[PDB]
Write an enzyme that holds these catalytic residues in place. Structure first.
Site, mmCIF file in Angstrom:
data_model
loop_
_atom_site.group_PDB
_atom_site.id
_atom_site.type_symbol
_atom_site.label_atom_id
_atom_site.label_comp_id
_atom_site.label_asym_id
_atom_site.label_seq_id
_atom_site.Cartn_x
_atom_site.Cartn_y
_atom_site.Cartn_z
ATOM 1 N N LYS A 99 -12.660 -24.973 7.897
ATOM 2 C CA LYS A 99 -12.497 -26.107 8.794
ATOM 3 C C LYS A 99 -11.349 -26.995 8.322
ATOM 4 O O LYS A 99 -10.532 -27.455 9.123
ATOM 5 C CB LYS A 99 -13.795 -26.916 8.861
ATOM 6 C CG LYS A 99 -14.979 -26.117 9.385
ATOM 7 C CD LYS A 99 -16.276 -26.886 9.218
ATOM 8 C CE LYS A 99 -17.466 -25.948 9.339
ATOM 9 N NZ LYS A 99 -18.604 -26.811 9.151
ATOM 10 N N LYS A 105 -22.248 -25.993 -6.293
ATOM 11 C CA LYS A 105 -21.056 -26.494 -5.598
ATOM 12 C C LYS A 105 -20.313 -27.471 -6.505
ATOM 13 O O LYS A 105 -19.170 -27.855 -6.228
ATOM 14 C CB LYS A 105 -21.439 -27.224 -4.305
ATOM 15 C CG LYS A 105 -22.526 -26.555 -3.499
ATOM 16 C CD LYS A 105 -21.959 -25.957 -2.254
ATOM 17 C CE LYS A 105 -22.952 -25.967 -1.115
ATOM 18 N NZ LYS A 105 -22.397 -25.104 -0.042
ATOM 19 N N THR A 152 -17.678 -22.249 4.717
ATOM 20 C CA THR A 152 -17.035 -22.345 6.035
ATOM 21 C C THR A 152 -16.345 -23.697 6.185
ATOM 22 O O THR A 152 -15.412 -23.848 6.975
ATOM 23 C CB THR A 152 -18.040 -22.178 7.192
ATOM 24 O OG1 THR A 152 -19.171 -23.020 6.961
ATOM 25 C CG2 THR A 152 -18.494 -20.738 7.298
ATOM 26 N N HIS A 168 -26.641 -13.991 2.761
ATOM 27 C CA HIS A 168 -25.829 -15.200 2.620
ATOM 28 C C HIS A 168 -25.735 -15.794 1.216
ATOM 29 O O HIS A 168 -25.086 -16.814 1.024
ATOM 30 C CB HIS A 168 -26.339 -16.295 3.568
ATOM 31 C CG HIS A 168 -26.238 -15.945 5.017
ATOM 32 N ND1 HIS A 168 -25.140 -16.270 5.788
ATOM 33 C CD2 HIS A 168 -27.101 -15.310 5.846
ATOM 34 C CE1 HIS A 168 -25.336 -15.848 7.026
ATOM 35 N NE2 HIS A 168 -26.515 -15.263 7.086
ATOM 36 N N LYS A 188 -20.424 -31.380 1.801
ATOM 37 C CA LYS A 188 -21.258 -30.199 1.926
ATOM 38 C C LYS A 188 -22.573 -30.576 1.266
ATOM 39 O O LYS A 188 -22.682 -31.636 0.644
ATOM 40 C CB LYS A 188 -20.645 -29.019 1.184
ATOM 41 C CG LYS A 188 -20.419 -29.297 -0.297
ATOM 42 C CD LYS A 188 -18.942 -29.277 -0.614
ATOM 43 C CE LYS A 188 -18.506 -27.909 -1.102
ATOM 44 N NZ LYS A 188 -17.798 -27.091 -0.074
ATOM 45 N N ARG A 189 -23.571 -29.713 1.384
ATOM 46 C CA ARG A 189 -24.857 -30.022 0.789
ATOM 47 C C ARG A 189 -24.729 -30.184 -0.717
ATOM 48 O O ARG A 189 -23.927 -29.502 -1.357
ATOM 49 C CB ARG A 189 -25.866 -28.926 1.130
ATOM 50 C CG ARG A 189 -26.265 -28.924 2.606
ATOM 51 C CD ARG A 189 -27.143 -30.124 2.954
ATOM 52 N NE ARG A 189 -28.383 -30.139 2.174
ATOM 53 C CZ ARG A 189 -29.567 -29.736 2.629
ATOM 54 N NH1 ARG A 189 -29.695 -29.283 3.873
ATOM 55 N NH2 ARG A 189 -30.631 -29.789 1.837
HETATM 56 C C1 LIG Z 1 -19.343 -26.523 8.083
HETATM 57 C C2 LIG Z 1 -20.572 -27.343 7.660
HETATM 58 C C3 LIG Z 1 -21.287 -27.019 6.489
HETATM 59 C C4 LIG Z 1 -20.879 -25.840 5.533
HETATM 60 O O1 LIG Z 1 -20.011 -26.375 4.520
HETATM 61 P P1 LIG Z 1 -19.669 -25.550 3.147
HETATM 62 O O2 LIG Z 1 -18.689 -26.410 2.443
HETATM 63 O O3 LIG Z 1 -19.299 -24.165 3.498
HETATM 64 O O4 LIG Z 1 -21.007 -25.531 2.315
HETATM 65 C C5 LIG Z 1 -22.335 -27.790 6.106
HETATM 66 N N1 LIG Z 1 -22.685 -28.862 6.853
HETATM 67 C C6 LIG Z 1 -22.013 -29.196 7.987
HETATM 68 C C7 LIG Z 1 -22.392 -30.485 8.681
HETATM 69 C C8 LIG Z 1 -20.949 -28.438 8.408
HETATM 70 O O5 LIG Z 1 -20.215 -28.813 9.517
HETATM 71 O O1 LIG Z 2 -22.783 -17.430 5.697
HETATM 72 C C1 LIG Z 2 -22.808 -18.807 6.010
HETATM 73 C C2 LIG Z 2 -23.059 -19.680 4.773
HETATM 74 O O2 LIG Z 2 -24.406 -19.405 4.275
HETATM 75 C C3 LIG Z 2 -24.844 -20.191 3.153
HETATM 76 O O3 LIG Z 2 -24.797 -21.570 3.502
HETATM 77 C C4 LIG Z 2 -23.893 -19.866 1.927
HETATM 78 O O4 LIG Z 2 -24.219 -20.656 0.803
HETATM 79 C C5 LIG Z 2 -22.379 -20.112 2.320
HETATM 80 O O5 LIG Z 2 -21.527 -19.639 1.300
HETATM 81 C C6 LIG Z 2 -22.009 -19.380 3.636
HETATM 82 O O6 LIG Z 2 -20.735 -19.803 4.062
#
Ligand SMILES: *Cc1c(COP(=O)(O)O)cnc(C)c1O
Ligand SMILES: OC[C@H]1O[C@H](O)[C@H](O)[C@@H](O)[C@@H]1O
Ligand SMILES: O=C(N[C@@H](Cc1ccc(F)cc1)C(=O)N1CCC(O)CC1)c1cc2cc(Cl)ccc2[nH]1
Ligand SMILES: O=C(N[C@@H](Cc1ccc(F)cc1)C(=O)N1CCC(O)CC1)c1cc2cc(Cl)ccc2[nH]1
Ligand SMILES: *Cc1c(COP(=O)(O)O)cnc(C)c1O
Ligand SMILES: OC[C@H]1O[C@H](O)[C@H](O)[C@@H](O)[C@@H]1O
Lengths: 811, 811
Positions: free
Chosen positions: B654, B548, B650, B351, B542-543
């Site tokens: 969304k 990022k 991901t 990942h 996101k985190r």
């Molecule tokens: C989808 C999701 C993430 C992943 O977000 P990225 O922008 O891909 O890092 C993280 N936290 C929550 C609460 C999510 O729903």
């Molecule tokens: O594979 C699921 C996720 O794993 C980790 O959070 C990675 O940083 C992200 O890029 C990826 O979308």
């Protein structure tokens, strides 16, 4: 099948489908993968469903009617299993028995799956449980308040003849009888300091622990009343209790340790901080809950008219200064008004006179953990001693004797003195014990306020201790006098007129033989040993304590063995002596006594010459569910504590109600039991309280007895030489040493009279008809020992409320 | 009301009475004292009841049919709430909505009471959850295996603009969705030592911790399939774990700490012993459960034909040596046969490529805790390197590079190398990431076994991420193309022919305006602030991570603010930029970035000249339930990681599915999203992976950018002088220092292109019709990013099983 209720066609059909509903939806199982534990849980839920309605209306009722509320504070509630008890009080036993039978299951097998709620050590804890049952049966608006330990009394294992302790993880598979109520979570404070500002004192910078309540229903006997037992659980706040983020979270278990485990001490004080925290925890959360309820029902003048708080021993004694803290510091009442209120709502029950059981907390502990409470205790003491000084001018010594603060090595607070000063009533638990309190231990207090002292002889509930554990005996009794006795035990007197009834005599003897056969089977089933059901079942089950003298019993057993070996071909009444009970983990002598008992059995049980005439069996893991099994199967009940040491005792009453004859000393309730049945129907022996005193003035010298009694000397020499411990000849040196040089309980002094008395018991047993007729006269006069009688007395003479046997308006 | 299912008259009547049944019998409440939480619980139980039947038959089905089983091992499962998700997949939403309405309740209000099951940190954890949903919807016999943390991801609180962490006690009020199963409790061993005796090695003198499973149902979308997610909980044995009796009992919490809390690290390795214990705990209990099930279904030759184990990252990597230990030490298989079996059943998913996220465990840790596993790892390494030596004779350097054992300061085991050697498949999570793995990080391994490397572009489930959180958009889509797309997202392409539809364009724009109005209200309701719903909703959630670059977003925000202050009366498209996400507790820079964001908002949000043209809001406690709220209300989605650092992402998918346009770099899945929608319909900017490399060869010098871009220099001087931190002028010195001297992510290098690109976004927004038409072309081409597609690929190319959309034989 029995007066376990009716088995209606519609009722049995309903129960079956609901049983299947729960097995499916609640347990997520199907008949192909369901285990007996699943089946037990499906039944528990099905029965539990019948309480909800009653529980809600009962509580609703108390809200509308607003009666005076009784709060029973105890750090122990020895409940045992609750499935069968609930069915009995709801008259569902036969219906559920039928329903499960038709579902192809054995209800008795399912009942054995339930874990005992062992939140108690022994007598004190089981009294609270019997009281809860009686209060509900008597229609009192009562609440039992305590702590929900996740680990109750340890499970006892015998390894190499030694006791091994194992954690009692009673909640592992879940407890269907409790109902968590996070909406009434309350904060409890610890440590901190006291700030004195303009308008009063303030307790600040405290550490907060949350108290979350878990409610358990307490159903009355067939009257539709369902009261509540509220147990507090410690929970850490999620903020501050949040160095390391991970550590902070793992550290939450420090605050939550308060309700983790029950201290395994019976009649013994251990001044550990964790124990003090538990005591304040239950007191602090309970009083907030009590006042909140009161405010709904701000003149606290009527507080005592609507509230009664009963302190089970001194464990919840901090309720007195805590009530003062709240009324004075928070509600801003003046000291004197607050004190008037406190004394009028609080009442204290004493359970023992041995010094090592008295709670004397070091002042430095209270100073660190509860600084404000220490100040209030000092002020209470101040004003109290002023009262004493006024009543007995110049009696400087009485002053120090009555002080709540004991000077010396380390200053300590005598919690018993605190309880007497802050309660409007103080009671002993048996007539002799209550008299001893006035004459000795609390003599100075009795002289100051004689009106405070009372007696409330203990009792046991006839539901669990007769109908539940001995349905056979309950049935033959009901066949003659009806069922009304179950909630009016005095009616048992009517059985006196059947003492010469050939039919009754045969029936009473029959149920006893059946109970013995069943127990004898259980012994081989779960413990594999084999015993002769034709022998006399001699049993002494209770916590191991020097004052209870399991050792005196041991000496008799060895005497019997020695007499048999001396004259092998002489006839003797066969006996199966069973001794059982747990020893507190740190009680060395008690653990040594358990090893002695198993060691005696190792020799006796394998001696070919003895045959099946004598068997010595140690009953493993004695607890409430086991008591329900042995007691109904007993012939002889051993209640042999040194006169003046057993406050009351309750096991003694359990045995009397179930058809066993009693051999015991004139101690505790034994005195009143013999008084009720007639001394001719009791096997009394040994020194009376007065003889013990006489011996103490003189000075007890065990050597004297050793020198004058050949049979005694032979036993002691057998212990010293290693006759009962070949590989370790000096294994029992500690016991022999204590017996000869520091026996606080004068075992030797009662030996001769005990053995002789035992001979008389054996002679009567040889005459079945006469043995049984005496049993009938005991059963027939046990009525006074029902906790319904005890509770009615507390109600009328201490709490100021009237009991009622009125059925609540259906469910 | 919507395709939330039908609201049958009989169905609504049934639901209502069952709701009332649970409120009474399950919750012990009546309409007069029931709280909204009680109402939520009554509904949860009513809905849960509809799964039991399906759950039992599904499991029963798999037993009879005996298909190949898929086991997804992960230390994280970011589930979120499950009430609404269950209603959707069961088509009960409208019926329950009606039923509660008639009971006088608001179902939406009740849904907000459910606690999020936050057993995950972010992307990796949420992927596992989406995968579980897809596997059930695709009829795969899959099981999710993990740890039941009693404390999930911490709750984030902003104090003084700073992040404060607070324990996530998500189980406080109970979890109706889990089912404890103490009948499958398994023992897990730790420490001990290895004994080599005649017939094999033995792991002895180990410390035992028990693993108790809790099962949670995973319903497929309207196909009656209900799979299981099994989470292990640590429980101490009651014996040995029984110096002090009290202490022994309190000490049980040491063993049970294993499952106490989730490590809050996202893409960051922390070599703590407790974490290693958690990893072995889940692996040890899971493999015992897997083999036990297999033995029911001893030739382990067919093991890989009936079992597939997917490793989510290297966290569960110990499964490889543990499978070997069991097969070789216990089942007595010869090494080579055991290894053949292991490789054929295991598959690993990578990942990330950042070095600080790679698991490299110190050998001394594995030596103490898992001595036998260390030996097996050494033997695996031995044989593997022999393979390498044979393939590349004399390449001594390749040998050390590919070793599972890293020499140096402290020897360490590279868990990723372990996973490649012991798996038959290794995959990246996006095309670019998978290529980077072969070209760089695992180049040596790819050269050795090219057949192992694959790609499986991530995806999200359209049930939670469309139907659940955006019913309005789902409805207008269904109105035109039907409902079949919900489990076949590719059909969304059919929406392409409505791109010029005046009606559709107006509808799509309408649901977005409604979603924004609703979110805007929620912001004032639970957080009180006020924002303009007419502005462009610019969001990056996101985190918090340097890679990022929330910092790049910050620079743009400050640029906007500065341009406004320069020409106050010039028109600009109003924006509401929202940034949200949690920072790992020990990540200093990340916590500093959160403070920066709140500090920027303090200045911008209170500048009168700015008015309502610019608002900077930090979204508190970002988690799954909040994502379901913000995402549907977003206009612009910020996916601006440095090219080559975000494996896939991901959140980006969304946002695309919910009608937001994307501004981002050619990183991770962004590349494939733009490829699907057409680059003209995407706002791409910045360096590509190749440009970053070129800059690294050259050497990145931030000063250059600072020297050539006046607007940039002005911002940096604003940060240094204390313009955003008056009371503490040097508060942000750390950030400025990093930006200027040690920026691993070249923030400055993408600044100019980012700002320019943002200008183009603002221009398009000024043209509602065209903005909306581009949105439609994004929504219409998001079909490829459904996790059903991803799962079907894993199934066909890695696990060897065929997905099926066949409804299971009713409930
Ligand atoms: C989808 C999701 C993430 C992943 O977000 P990225 O922008 O891909 O890092 C993280 N936290 C929550 C609460 C999510 O729903
Ligand atoms: O594979 C699921 C996720 O794993 C980790 O959070 C990675 O940083 C992200 O890029 C990826 O979308
Ligand atoms: O938890 C459930 N039932 C109770 C049924 C129950 C309730 C009380 C009790 F004492 C024993 C069993 C239970 O088994 N436990 C809760 C209490 C304890 O922790 C043991 C596990 C449950 C049923 C169910 C059905 C579905 Cl479809 C999903 C989740 C579920 N959980
Ligand atoms: O425990 C009961 N109901 C569950 C109903 C329930 C079940 C699962 C859940 F997540 C929430 C509520 C419950 O409230 N809790 C168990 C699980 C958790 O610890 C919270 C308290 C319960 C009902 C009841 C009725 C009677 Cl008459 C006696 C005891 C009882 N317990
Ligand atoms: C009744 C009871 C007791 C009290 O017995 P005594 O002989 O009065 O000390 C102790 N333990 C259990 C299990 C009981 O049922
Ligand atoms: O009062 C209940 C019981 O309390 C203690 O256990 C006493 O030792 C016992 O004599 C009494 O019966």
């Amino acid at each position: 099948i029995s007066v376990r209720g009716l088995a209606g066609v519609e009722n049995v059909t309903e129960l079956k489908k609901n049983f299947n509903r729960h097995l499916h939806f609640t347990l997520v199982k199907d008949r192909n993968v369901a285990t007996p534990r699943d089946y037990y849980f499906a039944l528990a839920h099905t029965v539990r469903d019948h309480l909800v309605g009653r529980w809600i209306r009962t509580q609703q009722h108390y809200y509308e009617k607003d009666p005076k509320r009784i709060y029973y504070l105890s750090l122990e509630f020895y409940m045992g299993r609750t499935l069968q008890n609930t069915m009995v009080n709801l008259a569902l036993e036969n219906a559920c028995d039928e329903a499960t039978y038709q579902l192809g299951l054995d209800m008795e097998e399912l009942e054995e799956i339930e874990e005992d709620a062992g939140l108690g050590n022994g007598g004190l804890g089981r009294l609270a449980a019997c009281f809860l049952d009686s209060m509900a049966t008597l229609g009192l608006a009562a609440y039992g308040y305590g702590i929900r330990y996740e680990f109750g009394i340890f499970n006892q294992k015998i390894c190499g003849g030694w006791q091994m302790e194992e954690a009692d993880d009673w909640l592992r598979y879940g407890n269907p009888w409790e109902k968590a109520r996070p909406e009434f979570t309350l904060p409890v404070h610890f440590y901190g300091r006291v700030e004195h500002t303009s308008q009063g004192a303030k307790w600040v910078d405290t550490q907060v622990v949350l108290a979350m309540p878990y409610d358990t229903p307490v159903p009355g006997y067939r009257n539709n009343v369902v009261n509540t037992m509220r147990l507090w659980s410690a929970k850490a706040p999620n903020d501050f209790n949040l160095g390391g983020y991970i550590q902070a979270v793992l550290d939450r278990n420090l605050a939550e340790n308060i309700s983790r485990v029950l201290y395994p001490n019976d009649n013994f004080f251990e001044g550990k901080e964790l124990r003090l925290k538990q005591e304040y925890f239950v007191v602090a959360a309970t009083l907030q809950d009590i006042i909140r309820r009161f405010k709904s029902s701000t003149n606290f003048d009527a507080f005592p008219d609507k509230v009664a708080i009963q302190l089970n021993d001194t464990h919840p004694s901090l309720a007195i200064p805590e009530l003062m803290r709240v009324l004075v510091d928070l509600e801003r009442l003046d000291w004197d008004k607050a004190w008037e209120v406190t004394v009028k709502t609080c009442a204290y029950t004493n359970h023992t006179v041995i010094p090592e059981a008295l709670e004397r907390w070091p002042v430095h502990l209270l100073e660190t953990l509860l600084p404000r409470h220490l100040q209030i205790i000092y002020e209470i003491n101040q004003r109290f001693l002023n009262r004493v000084a006024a009543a007995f001018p110049g009696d400087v010594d009485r002053l120090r004797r009555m002080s709540l603060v004991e000077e010396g090595a380390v200053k300590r607070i005598n919690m018993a003195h605190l309880c007497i000063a802050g309660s409007h009533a103080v009671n002993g638990v048996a007539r002799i014990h209550s008299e001893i309190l006035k004459k000795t231990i609390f003599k100075d207090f009795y002289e100051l306020e004689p009106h405070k002292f009372q007696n409330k002889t203990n009792g046991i509930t006839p539901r669990r201790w007769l109908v539940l554990c001995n349905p056979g005996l309950a049935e033959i009794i009901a066949e003659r006098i009806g069922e009304e006795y179950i909630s009016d035990l005095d009616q048992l007197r009517k059985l006196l007129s059947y003492v010469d009834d050939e039919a009754f005599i045969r029936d009473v003897a029959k149920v006893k033989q059946e109970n013995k056969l069943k127990f004898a089977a259980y012994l081989e089933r779960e413990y594999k040993v084999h015993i002769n059901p034709n022998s006399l079942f001699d049993v002494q089950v209770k916590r191991i304590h020097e004052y209870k003298r399991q050792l005196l019993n041991c000496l008799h057993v060895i005497t019997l063995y020695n007499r048999i070996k001396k004259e092998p071909n002489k006839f003797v009444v066969p006996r199966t002596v069973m001794i059982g009970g747990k020893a507190a983990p740190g009680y060395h002598m008690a653990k040594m006594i358990i090893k002695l008992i198993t060691a005696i059995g190792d020799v006796v049980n394998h001696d070919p010459v003895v045959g099946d005439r004598l068997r010595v069996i140690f009953l493993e893991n004695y607890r409430v569910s086991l008591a329900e099994k042995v007691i109904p199967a007993a012939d002889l009940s051993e209640q042999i504590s040194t006169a003046g040491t057993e406050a009351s005792g309750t096991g003694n009453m359990k045995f009397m109600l179930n058809g066993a004859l009693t051999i015991g000393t004139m101690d505790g309730a034994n005195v009143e039991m013999a008084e009720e049945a007639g001394e001719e129907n009791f096997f009394i022996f040994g020194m009376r309280v007065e003889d013990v005193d006489r011996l103490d003035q003189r000075g007890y010298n065990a050597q004297e007895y050793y020198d004058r009694i050949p049979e005694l000397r032979q036993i002691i020499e057998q212990l010293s030489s290693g006759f009962f411990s070949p590989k370790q000849p000096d294994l029992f040196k500690d016991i022999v040493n204590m017996l000869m040089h520091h026996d606080r309980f004068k075992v030797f002094a009662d030996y001769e009279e005990y053995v002789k008395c035992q001979e008389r018991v054996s002679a009567l047993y040889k005459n079945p008809r006469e043995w049984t007729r005496m049993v009938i006269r005991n059963i027939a006069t046990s009525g006074k020992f029902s906790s319904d009688r005890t509770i009615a007395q507390y109600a009328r003479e201490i709490w100021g409320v009237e009991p009622s046997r009125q059925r609540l308006p259906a469910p």
